[PDB]
Coordinates of C-alpha atoms and ligand atoms in Angstrom, one line a residue:
X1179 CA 62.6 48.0 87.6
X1180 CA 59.4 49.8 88.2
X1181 CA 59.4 53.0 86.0
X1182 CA 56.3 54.5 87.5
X1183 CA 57.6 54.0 91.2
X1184 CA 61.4 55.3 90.3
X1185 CA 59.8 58.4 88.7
X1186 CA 57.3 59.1 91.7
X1187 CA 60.4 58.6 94.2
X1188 CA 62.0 61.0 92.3
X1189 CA 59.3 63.7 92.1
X1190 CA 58.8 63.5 95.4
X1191 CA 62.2 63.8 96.2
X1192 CA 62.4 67.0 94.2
X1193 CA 59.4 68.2 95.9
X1194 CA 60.2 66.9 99.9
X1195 CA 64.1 68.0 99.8
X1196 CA 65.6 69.6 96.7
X1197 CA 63.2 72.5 96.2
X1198 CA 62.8 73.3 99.8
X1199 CA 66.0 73.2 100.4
X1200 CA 67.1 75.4 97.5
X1201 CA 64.1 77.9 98.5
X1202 CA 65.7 78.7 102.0
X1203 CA 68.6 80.1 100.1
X1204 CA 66.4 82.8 98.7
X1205 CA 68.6 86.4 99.9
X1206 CA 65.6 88.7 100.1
X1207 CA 68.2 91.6 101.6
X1208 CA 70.2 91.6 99.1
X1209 CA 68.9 89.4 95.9
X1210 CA 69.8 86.6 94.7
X1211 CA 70.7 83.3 96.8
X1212 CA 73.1 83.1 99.8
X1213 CA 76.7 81.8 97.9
X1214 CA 78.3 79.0 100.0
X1215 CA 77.0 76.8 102.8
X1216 CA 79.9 74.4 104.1
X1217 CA 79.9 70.8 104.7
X1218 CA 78.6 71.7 108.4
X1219 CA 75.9 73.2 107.1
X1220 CA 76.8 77.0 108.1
X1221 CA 75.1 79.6 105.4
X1222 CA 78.1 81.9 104.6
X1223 CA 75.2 84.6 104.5
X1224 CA 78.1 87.5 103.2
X1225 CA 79.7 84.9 100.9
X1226 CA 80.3 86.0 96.9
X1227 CA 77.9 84.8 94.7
X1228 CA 78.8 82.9 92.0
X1229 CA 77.3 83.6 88.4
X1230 CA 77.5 79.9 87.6
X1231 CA 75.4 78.8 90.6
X1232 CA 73.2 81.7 90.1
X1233 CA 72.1 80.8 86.6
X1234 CA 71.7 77.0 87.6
X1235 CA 69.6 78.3 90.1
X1236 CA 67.3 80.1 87.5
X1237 CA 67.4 77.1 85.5
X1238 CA 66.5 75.0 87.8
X1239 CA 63.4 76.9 89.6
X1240 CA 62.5 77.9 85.7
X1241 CA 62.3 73.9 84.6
X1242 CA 60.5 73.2 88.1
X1243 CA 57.8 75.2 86.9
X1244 CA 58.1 74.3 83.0
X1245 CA 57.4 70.4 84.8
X1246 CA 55.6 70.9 87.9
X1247 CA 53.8 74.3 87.3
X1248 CA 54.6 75.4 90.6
X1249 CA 54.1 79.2 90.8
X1250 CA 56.5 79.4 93.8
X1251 CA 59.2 77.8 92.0
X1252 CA 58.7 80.4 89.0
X1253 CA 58.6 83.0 91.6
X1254 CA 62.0 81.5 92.6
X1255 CA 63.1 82.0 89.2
X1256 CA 62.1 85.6 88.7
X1257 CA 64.0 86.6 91.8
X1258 CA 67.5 84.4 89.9
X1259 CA 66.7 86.8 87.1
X1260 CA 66.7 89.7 88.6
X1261 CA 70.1 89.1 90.2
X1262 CA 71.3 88.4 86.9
X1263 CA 69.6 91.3 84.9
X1264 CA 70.6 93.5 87.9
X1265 CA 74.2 92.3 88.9
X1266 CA 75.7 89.9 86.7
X1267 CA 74.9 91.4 83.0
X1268 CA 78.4 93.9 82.9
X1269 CA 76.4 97.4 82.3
X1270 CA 79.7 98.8 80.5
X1271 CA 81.3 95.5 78.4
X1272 CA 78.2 93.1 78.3
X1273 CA 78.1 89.5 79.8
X1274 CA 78.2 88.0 82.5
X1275 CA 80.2 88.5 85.3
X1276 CA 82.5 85.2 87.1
X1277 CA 81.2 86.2 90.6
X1278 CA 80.2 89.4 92.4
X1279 CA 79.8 90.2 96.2
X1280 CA 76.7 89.1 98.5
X1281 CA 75.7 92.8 97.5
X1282 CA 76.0 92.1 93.7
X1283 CA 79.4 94.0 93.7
X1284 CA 81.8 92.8 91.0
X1285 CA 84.2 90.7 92.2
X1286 CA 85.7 88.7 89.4
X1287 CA 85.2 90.7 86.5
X1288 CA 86.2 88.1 83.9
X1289 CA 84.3 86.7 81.3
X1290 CA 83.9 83.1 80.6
X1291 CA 82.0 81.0 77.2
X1292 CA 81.2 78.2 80.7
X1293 CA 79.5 81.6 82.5
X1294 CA 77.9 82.7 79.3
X1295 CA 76.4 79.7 78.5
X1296 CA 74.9 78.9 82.0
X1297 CA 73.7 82.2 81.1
X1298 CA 71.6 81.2 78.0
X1299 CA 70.3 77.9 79.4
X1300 CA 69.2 79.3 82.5
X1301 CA 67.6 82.4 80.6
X1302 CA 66.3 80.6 77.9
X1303 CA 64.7 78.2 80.4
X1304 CA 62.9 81.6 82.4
X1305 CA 61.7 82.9 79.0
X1306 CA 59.4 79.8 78.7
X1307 CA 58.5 79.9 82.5
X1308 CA 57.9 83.2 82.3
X1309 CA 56.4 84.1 79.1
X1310 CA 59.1 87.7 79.6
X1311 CA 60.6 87.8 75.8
X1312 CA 63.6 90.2 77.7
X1313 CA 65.0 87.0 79.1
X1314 CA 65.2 85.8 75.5
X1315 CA 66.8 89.1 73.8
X1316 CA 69.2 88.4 76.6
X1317 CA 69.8 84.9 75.8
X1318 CA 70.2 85.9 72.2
X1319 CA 73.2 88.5 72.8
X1320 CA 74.7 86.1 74.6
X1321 CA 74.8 84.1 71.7
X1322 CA 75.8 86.6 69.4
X1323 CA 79.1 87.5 71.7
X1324 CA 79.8 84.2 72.4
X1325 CA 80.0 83.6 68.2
X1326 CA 81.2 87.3 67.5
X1327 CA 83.9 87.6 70.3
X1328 CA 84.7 83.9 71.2
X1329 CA 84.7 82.0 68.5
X1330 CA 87.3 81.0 66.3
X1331 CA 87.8 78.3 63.3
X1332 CA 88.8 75.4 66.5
X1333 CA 85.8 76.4 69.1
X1334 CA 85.7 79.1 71.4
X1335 CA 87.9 80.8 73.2
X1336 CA 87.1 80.0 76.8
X1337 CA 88.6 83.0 79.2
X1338 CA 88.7 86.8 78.4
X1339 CA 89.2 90.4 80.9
X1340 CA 86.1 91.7 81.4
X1341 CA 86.5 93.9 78.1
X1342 CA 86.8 90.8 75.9
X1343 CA 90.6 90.4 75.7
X1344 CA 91.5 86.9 75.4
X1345 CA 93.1 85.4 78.8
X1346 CA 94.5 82.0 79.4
X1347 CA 91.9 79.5 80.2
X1348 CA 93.1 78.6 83.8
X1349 CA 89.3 78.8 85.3
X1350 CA 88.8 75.5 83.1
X1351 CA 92.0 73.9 83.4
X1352 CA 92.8 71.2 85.7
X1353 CA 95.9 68.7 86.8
X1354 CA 98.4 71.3 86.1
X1355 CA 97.8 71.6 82.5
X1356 CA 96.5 75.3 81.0
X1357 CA 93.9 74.2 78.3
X1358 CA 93.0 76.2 75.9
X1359 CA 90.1 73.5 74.5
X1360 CA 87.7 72.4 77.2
X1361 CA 85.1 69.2 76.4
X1362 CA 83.8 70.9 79.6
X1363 CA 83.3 74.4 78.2
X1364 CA 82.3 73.5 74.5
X1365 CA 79.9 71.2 76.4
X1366 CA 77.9 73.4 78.0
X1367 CA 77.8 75.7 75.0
X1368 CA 76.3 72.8 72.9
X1369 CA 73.9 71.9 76.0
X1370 CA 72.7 75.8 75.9
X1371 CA 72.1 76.1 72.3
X1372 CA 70.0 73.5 72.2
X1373 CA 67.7 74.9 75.1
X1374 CA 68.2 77.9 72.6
X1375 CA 66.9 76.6 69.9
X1376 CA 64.3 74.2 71.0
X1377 CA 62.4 77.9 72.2
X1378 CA 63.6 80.7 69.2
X1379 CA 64.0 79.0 66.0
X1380 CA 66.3 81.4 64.5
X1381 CA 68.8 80.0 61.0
X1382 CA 71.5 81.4 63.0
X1383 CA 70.8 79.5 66.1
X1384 CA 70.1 75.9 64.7
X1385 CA 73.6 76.4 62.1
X1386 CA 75.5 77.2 65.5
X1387 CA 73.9 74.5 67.2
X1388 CA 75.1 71.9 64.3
X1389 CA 78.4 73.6 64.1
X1390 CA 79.2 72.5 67.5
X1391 CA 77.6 69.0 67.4
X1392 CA 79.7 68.5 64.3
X1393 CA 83.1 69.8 66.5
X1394 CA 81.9 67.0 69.4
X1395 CA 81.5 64.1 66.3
X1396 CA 84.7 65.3 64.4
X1397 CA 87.6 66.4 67.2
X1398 CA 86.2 66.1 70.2
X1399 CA 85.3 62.1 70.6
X1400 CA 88.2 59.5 70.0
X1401 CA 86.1 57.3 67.8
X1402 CA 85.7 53.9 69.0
X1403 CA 86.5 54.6 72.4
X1404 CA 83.7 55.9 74.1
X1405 CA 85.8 58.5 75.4
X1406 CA 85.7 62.3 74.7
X1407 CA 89.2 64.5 75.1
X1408 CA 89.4 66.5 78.0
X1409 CA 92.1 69.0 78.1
X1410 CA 93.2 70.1 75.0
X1411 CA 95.3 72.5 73.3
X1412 CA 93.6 75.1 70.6
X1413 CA 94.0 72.0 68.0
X1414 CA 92.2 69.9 70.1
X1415 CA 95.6 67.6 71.1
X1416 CA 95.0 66.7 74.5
X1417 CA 97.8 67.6 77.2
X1418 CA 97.4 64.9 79.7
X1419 CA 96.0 61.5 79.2
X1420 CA 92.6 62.1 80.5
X1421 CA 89.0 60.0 80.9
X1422 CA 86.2 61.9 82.7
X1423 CA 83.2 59.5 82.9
X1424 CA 80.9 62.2 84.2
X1425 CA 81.4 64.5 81.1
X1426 CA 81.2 60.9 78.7
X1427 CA 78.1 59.9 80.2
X1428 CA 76.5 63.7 80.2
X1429 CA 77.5 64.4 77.0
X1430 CA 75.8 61.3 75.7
X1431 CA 72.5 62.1 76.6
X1432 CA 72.9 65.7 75.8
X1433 CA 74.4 65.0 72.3
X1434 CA 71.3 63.0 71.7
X1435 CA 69.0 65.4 72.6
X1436 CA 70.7 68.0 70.6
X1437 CA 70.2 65.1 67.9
X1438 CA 66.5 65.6 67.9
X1439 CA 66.8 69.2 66.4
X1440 CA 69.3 68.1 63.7
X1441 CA 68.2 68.7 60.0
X1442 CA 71.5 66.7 58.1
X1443 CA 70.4 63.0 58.8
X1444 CA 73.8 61.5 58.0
X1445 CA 75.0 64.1 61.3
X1446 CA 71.8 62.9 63.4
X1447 CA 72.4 58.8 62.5
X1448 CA 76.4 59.5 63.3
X1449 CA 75.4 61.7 67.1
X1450 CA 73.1 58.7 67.7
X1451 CA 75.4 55.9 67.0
X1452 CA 78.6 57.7 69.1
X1453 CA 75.9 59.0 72.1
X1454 CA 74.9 55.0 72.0
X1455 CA 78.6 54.0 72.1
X1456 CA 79.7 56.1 75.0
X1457 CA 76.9 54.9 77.2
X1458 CA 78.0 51.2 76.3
X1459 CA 81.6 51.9 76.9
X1460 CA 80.9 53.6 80.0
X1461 CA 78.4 51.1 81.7
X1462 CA 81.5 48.4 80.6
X1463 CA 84.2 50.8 81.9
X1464 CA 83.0 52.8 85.1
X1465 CA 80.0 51.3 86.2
X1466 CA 80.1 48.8 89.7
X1467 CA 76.9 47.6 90.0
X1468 CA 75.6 50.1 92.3
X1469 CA 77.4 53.6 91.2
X1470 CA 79.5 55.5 88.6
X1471 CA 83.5 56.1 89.1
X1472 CA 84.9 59.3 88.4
X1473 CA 88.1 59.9 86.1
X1474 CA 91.5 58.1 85.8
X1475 CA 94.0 61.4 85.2
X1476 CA 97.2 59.3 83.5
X1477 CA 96.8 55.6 85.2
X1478 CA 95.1 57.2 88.2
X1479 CA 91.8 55.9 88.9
X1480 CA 89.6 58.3 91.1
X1481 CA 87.2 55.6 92.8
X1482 CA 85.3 58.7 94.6
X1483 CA 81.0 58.6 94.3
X1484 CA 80.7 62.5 93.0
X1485 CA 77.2 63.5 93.2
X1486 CA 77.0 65.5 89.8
X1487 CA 78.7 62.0 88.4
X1488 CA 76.0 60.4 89.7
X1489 CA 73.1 62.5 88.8
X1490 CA 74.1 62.4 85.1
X1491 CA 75.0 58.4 85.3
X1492 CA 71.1 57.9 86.0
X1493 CA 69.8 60.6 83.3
X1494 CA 72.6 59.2 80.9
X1495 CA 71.3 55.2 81.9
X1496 CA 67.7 56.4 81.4
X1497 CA 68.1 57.7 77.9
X1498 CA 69.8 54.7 76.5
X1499 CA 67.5 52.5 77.8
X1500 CA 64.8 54.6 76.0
X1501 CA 66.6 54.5 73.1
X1502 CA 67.6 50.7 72.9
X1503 CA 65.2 49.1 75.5
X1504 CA 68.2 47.2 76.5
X1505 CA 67.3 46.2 80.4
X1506 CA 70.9 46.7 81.6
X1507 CA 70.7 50.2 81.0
X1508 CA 67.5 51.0 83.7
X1509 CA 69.3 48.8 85.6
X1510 CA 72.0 51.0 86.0
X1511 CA 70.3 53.6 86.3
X1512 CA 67.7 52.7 88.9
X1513 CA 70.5 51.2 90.7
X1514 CA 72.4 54.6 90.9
X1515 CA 69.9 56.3 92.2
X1516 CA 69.2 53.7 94.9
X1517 CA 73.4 54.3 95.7
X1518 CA 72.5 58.2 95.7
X1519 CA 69.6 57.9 98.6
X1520 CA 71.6 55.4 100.1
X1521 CA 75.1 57.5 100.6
X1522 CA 74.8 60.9 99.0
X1523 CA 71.4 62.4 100.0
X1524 CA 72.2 63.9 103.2
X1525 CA 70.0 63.1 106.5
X1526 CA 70.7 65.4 108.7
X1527 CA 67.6 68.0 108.7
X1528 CA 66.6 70.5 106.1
X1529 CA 69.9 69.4 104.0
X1530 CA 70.4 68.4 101.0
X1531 CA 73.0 66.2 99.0
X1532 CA 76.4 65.3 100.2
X1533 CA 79.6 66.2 97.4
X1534 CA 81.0 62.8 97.7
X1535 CA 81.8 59.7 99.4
X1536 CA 85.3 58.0 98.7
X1537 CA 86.1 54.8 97.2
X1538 CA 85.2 53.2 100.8
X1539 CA 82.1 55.2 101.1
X1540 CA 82.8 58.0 103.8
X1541 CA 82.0 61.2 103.3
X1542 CA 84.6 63.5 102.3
X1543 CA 84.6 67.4 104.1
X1544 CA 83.3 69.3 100.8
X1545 CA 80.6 72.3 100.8
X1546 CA 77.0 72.0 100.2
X1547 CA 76.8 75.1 98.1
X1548 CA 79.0 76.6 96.3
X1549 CA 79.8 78.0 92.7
X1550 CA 80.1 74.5 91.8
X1551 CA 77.4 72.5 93.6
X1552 CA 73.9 73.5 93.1
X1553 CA 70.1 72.4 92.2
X1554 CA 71.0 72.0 88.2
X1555 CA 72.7 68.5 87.9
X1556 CA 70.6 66.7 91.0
X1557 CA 67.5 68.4 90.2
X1558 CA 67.4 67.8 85.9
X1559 CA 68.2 64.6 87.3
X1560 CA 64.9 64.5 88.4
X1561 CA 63.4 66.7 85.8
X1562 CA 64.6 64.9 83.4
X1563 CA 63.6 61.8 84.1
X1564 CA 59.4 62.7 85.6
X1565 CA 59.5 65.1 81.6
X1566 CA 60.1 61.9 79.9
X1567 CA 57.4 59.8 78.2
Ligands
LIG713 O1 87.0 72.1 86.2 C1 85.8 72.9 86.3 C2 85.0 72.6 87.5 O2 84.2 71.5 87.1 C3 83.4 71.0 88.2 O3 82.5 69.9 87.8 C4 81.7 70.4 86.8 C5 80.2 70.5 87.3 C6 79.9 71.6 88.3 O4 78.8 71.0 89.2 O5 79.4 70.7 86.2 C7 80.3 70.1 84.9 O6 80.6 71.1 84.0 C8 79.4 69.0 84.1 O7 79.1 69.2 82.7 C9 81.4 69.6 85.5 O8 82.7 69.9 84.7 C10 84.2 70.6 89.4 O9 83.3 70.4 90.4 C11 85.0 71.8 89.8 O10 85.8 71.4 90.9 C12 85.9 72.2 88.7 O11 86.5 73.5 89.1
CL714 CL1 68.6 92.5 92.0
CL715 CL1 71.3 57.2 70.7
CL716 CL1 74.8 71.7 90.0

């Protein structure tokens, strides 16, 4: 359980395959990065480009600078921006588009709080790579859509046309079940707003920021469980008997870090005590000694290795041990990651990670990128851990 070693694997890691790997993506004909690359490893060069993978893309080169000051990586960055600036930001309704073509053409048109949050983290994260306050006026009218147009007395409203007329939230929805009340979605909005915050310290910001929090503590977790709802209607009654332990175990270390910001101290104590909880119950519940399961949708458990499960089991491991210095946790962590190099990194040449293995450990037929898979879980993975002290 040498810290100093784990971290130095995982920088260089970062630095020997994840950055590389990401850089070759780099579409110099027609912006952006290339949009889908298949299990075979065949670059669909002409492939649509999805805004989620494009903002995590941002992020991600953005934070390897913030950590590594690599002016190549905020190079990286600058070119993700101006794909967003240029093709993603709707010129005529404002936000963010779902996906447009290879050329930046619109291709779906509708507008999602998931995309528009990407959106803010990614941006937010450029403005402090870059020192360009644009990325940050951008950022901010994000925000002020997402709590102008989306929100309501319940959360957001997750899916809209491209003009901001509420849609049904079937981009978010899974196992047959149209959710209007994603943990995913509201998630990712608490996750942006405090990458908001932390860099523009505005009343408006940091009362959003604990509005949310306070919807995770209040309807979101099932208190005593460890276990947040997953699919919900609009009053936040789930659909289908759900437990996602990727989204517990992420949402544990990201409710603590939006903890840190947190002025009520009754609020901060409470977000401590339930981000503590979930990474008890899931270490109990999900974790085999070497890896992370995935979800058990009504009594079916998934036993598949997902990388992004994964990725966040060792950030999510690594923050409770910091917080209780209980061994079992960097453990777990360090163990996971040992499972990761072992059956997910890829070896084949100039790759990257794998999607998954299955319960038996074979690799599953899944792409390497897509609008789903890209540098922002397995690279904060190792961002995360080489920023921490
Ligand atoms: O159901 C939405 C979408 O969820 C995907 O898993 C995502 C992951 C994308 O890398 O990032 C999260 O939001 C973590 O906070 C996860 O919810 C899943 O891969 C994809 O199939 C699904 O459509
Ligand atoms: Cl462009
Ligand atoms: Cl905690
Ligand atoms: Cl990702």
């Amino acid at each position: 359980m040498d810290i100093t070693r784990f971290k130095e694997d995982l920088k260089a890691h970062l630095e020997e395959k994840i950055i590389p790997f990401w850089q070759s993506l780099k579409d110099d004909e027609f912006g952006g990065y290339y949009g889908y690359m298949d299990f075979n490893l065949n670059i669909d060069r002409k492939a649509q480009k999805g805004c989620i993978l494009n903002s995590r893309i941002l992020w991600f080169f953005s934070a390897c600078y913030n950590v590594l000051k690599s002016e190549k990586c905020k190079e990286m960055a600058f070119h993700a921006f101006e794909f967003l600036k240029n093709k993603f930001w709707d010129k005529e309704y404002e936000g963010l588009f779902w996906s447009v073509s290879h050329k930046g053409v619109p291709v779906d048109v509708t507008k999602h709080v998931y995309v528009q949050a990407f959106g803010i983290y990614g941006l937010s994260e450029y403005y402090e790579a870059s020192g360009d306050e644009e990325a940050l006026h951008m950022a901010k009218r994000l925000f002020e859509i997402l709590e102008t147009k989306c929100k309501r007395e319940n959360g957001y409203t997750e899916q809209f046309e491209r003009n901001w007329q509420e849609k049904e939230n079937r981009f978010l929805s899974e196992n047959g079940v149209i959710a209007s009340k994603t943990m995913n979605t509201h998630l990712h909005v608490l996750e942006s707003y405090t990458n908001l915050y932390r860099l523009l310290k505005l009343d408006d910001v940091y009362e959003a920021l604990e509005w949310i929090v306070r919807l995770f503590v209040d309807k979101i977790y099932k208190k005593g469980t460890g276990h947040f709802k997953v699919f919900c209607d609009d009053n936040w009654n789930e659909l289908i008997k759900a437990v996602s332990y990727g989204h517990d175990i992420e949402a544990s270390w990201l409710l603590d870090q939006a903890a840190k910001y947190l002025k009520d101290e009754k609020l901060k104590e409470e977000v401590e005590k339930l981000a503590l909880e979930v990474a008890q119950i899931t270490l109990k519940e999900a974790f085999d000694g070497q890896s992370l399961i995935n979800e058990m949708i009504e009594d079916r458990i998934d036993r598949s290795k997902i990388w992004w499960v994964e990725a966040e089991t060792v950030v999510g491991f690594f923050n409770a041990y910091q917080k209780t210095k209980e061994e079992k946790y960097l453990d777990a962590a360090i163990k996971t990651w040992e499972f990761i190099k072992e059956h997910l990194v890829d070896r084949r040449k100039n790759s990257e990670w794998l999607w998954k293995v299955n319960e038996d450990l074979e690799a599953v037929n899944m792409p390497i990128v897509e609008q789903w898979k890209c540098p922002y879980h397995n690279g904060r993975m190792c961002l995360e851990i080489i920023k921490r002290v």
